[PDB]
Design a protein around this ligand. Structure first.
Ligand code: ADP
Ligand code: ADP
Ligand code: ADP
Lengths: 365, 365, 365
């Protein structure tokens, strides 16, 4: 059976018989804006994130997915086509597939997504599973509160003894792309300017390399405003040097207290405490000291040691607080997908073609 | 032969060849309220007070027994199944059993209870015995007035020279569970709130730990309203501190003068005097100075020294009054059950299978 | 004398010489989140529900009161200041005032509330009265069971011949704000999203306009899933149309069987039957057929005709059941406040300054 993590930002896919994905590519569809001045194939009508990442510049870049909701399904179907035929060389009619989505999403999403997945690609069996549950499979726990944070979605789910508290789930649409745009908007403080889609991938790669989360933001500010040498240099692809300072932390720190973005919500530590405070009074002792981090934007160095200091300053004292931040968080959800796909007891739960032929797309409910 | 104290509140069981029970667990059956988000065996259809006490939170809690009357027999049969197979590891067809009940109860109770006990578990021999009689066995007296007070039932039986006066027995359905709910309803005076079954066990454990009976309630009220330091603190399972004051006594004191509950009856001291005043005129001298306390809710510190001062203020003077409050009152009825089960002369009194095959369940009468 | 209904949600105030309040405004205090880019007076340090309702967007909105308990008294004192000086144009030192509260509340509330009311505003005389009693004044009955349901509190009080049974009162913290948040959490099923305080008032006004209570919820569900045209459209303040269907009832219906919210209590019909079953056996015949509904969230169309069908299915047959749902339920408690304030025989019951100068704030007891 195939496991495809159509999370936002990049697609990750492979077989359930493996410990890591076989494909990891940036989910972009890119289209040329200039005509072919010399005869050849070298100006295709469209490119997908495998090759559109390197032919950027002459291409505009648009994602099929935003805030975890698919905006144009033809781009997504093109990406699934690339994942099945071009990358894993596999006929989708041969293999069952399971697909990930955010916990709360417009229900029509699941309906269209399955209608495509086995009316067009005619896959034999299908199942949709929420990412936070799959992350626990990857950790192998049965009690815990999972936090996920990727491109444009953050959410949390409490689970105890394998039971989720659906009244205690939260979304918080703050992570990633809304945080890259802040880097774009703060980096113009130095003077550098970045205006276009292909040029944004530079700012993304900057953020993926030159970023750390301060444990005491006020004192890092007081240090970087001193004579301290804290800057590092980045070479742009044309050879222009970039120096970054007073910014390597002041970007990711806006994941906490997101009033810097004018988002009037509570932040990641607040919504972690405010999710545990929705659970029953004796569940707190076992969700505390089992906080599990997941997903790309949890990868900055120093996250866990700040988050722990924030929660411990906020939760009632005389309670053990531990944050389970493993490595490989980027793949955690796919690993758990491979696990759940492999468990023999789960094999009765797939929606088969026979069910959909009776019920149609609302069988997902 | 087995002795099982299926009194209300918690089940206590063991062999007659012992001085204390081998099992003591809260008689609860608990059921999940949330569907399964994660795969496993870890969510049985039902749990019993051994594990439902710790898996509370994810469970609703319902007792099979209320006011000493069984409300749902399938929950009780599940508890007997747990006591025989799971807890005492004993084949019920091997051993006779004796079972306790309240003195006055709907007769259909005894009928169903024995029908189950040796039509289903097919026990070889059976007997039902009233708790107050069994308590005298535990004290070893043959003259006395016994008071019992447990989860939801209080009653009294006078016995002289081993004879009970059935015209002088009283029930008074005031103890225990109706007194925890009053703590729940008075503790909201501080501001704390407790709404649900699992959360009530916290208030029960509070009551089991932070309670004392005032000898001069009016003066303890006048003291706690003074500058006196009289509060104590309880840590909830989440680490929230609770402070309790002007309440640690004002809860159990409602066992006397139950007009605080709007129950228009007389109270425990009144119904003790009003039971002795039903006995013959020369029996008073020997029921006085042989008052025997029994059952859980007689365990609060200061009970006996109040009760003596109340009865002595009410009974005619120039009479010696003594209250036999031993330790181990919690087990007293089970101890007496073990005694009566051990006496060889009693061994002719069990109802055998041969009797029931003639008479059916009404053979208990 | 003034009558101020400082119930939760919105403040309603006026003179006892009137049949309806003179002020009705949403009790919000709002504070700016942005520094001044343009010169003027137009950004006060704080605003109150008169103007903070229209300057929302640029304001954060916080209530002083939640679950009927005041959380920050300075916001409340600011609201009382606005009601006396700014709205009713009245010197508080001239007039006695009576104030409403929920039946069970932390006692410190009444103490602080009166300390403020005539240590700061220096009112000459003061009295606190429970809302359910005041509702009977508005109906003019002397026997009845009153149900109240507003912003964040529901409770019930039985009264017979003008006497309440304090052992039979219940709170049930389910109404209103916990039911708007459910609309926020169910409306994301369509795809629309609402994240912030000012934006929540839109969902509240939706609920106040596009809501009805189904008499047979299962059949309305079966109808809305058909081809039936049952949706209605709401225009947002920006002109975005919203269509709502299969939801206009599935929100308020969660006031019954609140397991949809994961609140493990019984619901409004259950706690109405379970309150009458605490009264004496001959009172039932006269509390039945005098159930009186009160307070805002009882205003949905179809409530009464469902509630009657629920109670009649549950109460013993051959009993007349009638629900007294008058119009003007929103003002009922204030009307009764005006009545009780006007009765000359009541005029001895106010706490005067002379009493408080001896007793301090606990004179309310
Ligand atoms: N090394 C890194 N450290 C921190 N964040 C990263 C790193 N690499 C990628 N990211 C973040 O993750 C995004 C890539 O997609 P991601 O959100 O991880 O999708 P998914 O969660 O589905 O894997 C990047 O745009 C970036 O915001
Ligand atoms: N240490 C204690 N002091 C006072 N009361 C107690 C104590 N422990 C238990 N109780 C009361 O006894 C109840 C336990 O069941 P109980 O009524 O004793 O049943 P039984 O009488 O059948 O043993 C508790 O709910 C509590 O009300
Ligand atoms: N027309 C209406 N129909 C149903 N419910 C309403 C209506 N108007 C207001 N409400 C409910 O009443 C709330 C307003 O405050 P309310 O609870 O009535 O306070 P009070 O009971 O003190 O007047 C609103 O938030 C809403 O939940």
């Amino acid at each position: 059976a195939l496991v495809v993590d159509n999370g936002s930002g990049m697609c990750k896919a492979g077989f359930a018989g493996d410990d890591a994905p076989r494909a990891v590519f940036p989910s972009i569809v890119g289209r040329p804006r200039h005509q072919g001045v010399m005869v050849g194939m070298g100006q295709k009508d469209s490119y997908v994130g495998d090759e559109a990442q390197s032919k950027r510049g002459i291409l505009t870049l648009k994602y099929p997915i935003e805030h975890g909701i698919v905006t144009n399904w033809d781009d997504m179907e093109k990406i699934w086509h690339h994942t099945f035929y071009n990358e894993l060389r596999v006929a989708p009619e041969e293999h069952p597939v399971l697909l990930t989505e955010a916990p709360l999403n417009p229900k029509a999403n699941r309906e269209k997504m399955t209608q495509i997945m086995f009316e067009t690609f005619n896959t034999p069996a299908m199942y949709v599973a929420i990412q936070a549950v799959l992350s626990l499979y990857a950790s192998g726990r049965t009690t815990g509160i999972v936090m996920d944070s990727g491109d444009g979605v953050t959410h949390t789910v409490p689970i105890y003894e394998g039971y989720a508290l659906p009244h205690a789930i939260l979304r918080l649409d703050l992570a990633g792309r809304d945080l890259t745009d802040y880097l774009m908007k703060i980096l113009t403080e130095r003077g550098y300017s970045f205006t276009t889609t292909a040029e944004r991938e530079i700012v993304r790669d900057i953020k993926e390399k030159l970023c750390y989360v301060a444990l005491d933001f006020e004192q890092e500010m007081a240090t970087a405003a001193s004579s301290s040498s804290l800057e590092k240099s980045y070479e742009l692809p044309d050879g222009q040097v970039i120096t970054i300072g007073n910014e390597r932390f002041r970007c990711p720190e806006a994941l906490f207290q997101p009033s810097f973005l004018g988002m009037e919500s509570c932040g990641i530590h607040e919504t972690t405490f405010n999710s545990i405070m929705k659970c029953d009074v004796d569940i707190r002792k076992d969700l505390y000291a089992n906080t599990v981090l997941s997903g790309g934007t949890t990868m900055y160095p120093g996250i866990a040691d700040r988050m722990q200091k924030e929660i411990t300053a906020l939760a009632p004292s005389t309670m053990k607080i531990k944050i389970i931040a493993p490595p490989e968080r980027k793949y955690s959800v796919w690993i758990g997908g491979s696990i759940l796909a492999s468990l023999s007891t789960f094999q009765q739960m797939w929606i088969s073609k026979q069910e959909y032929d009776e019920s149609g797309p609302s069988i997902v409910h």
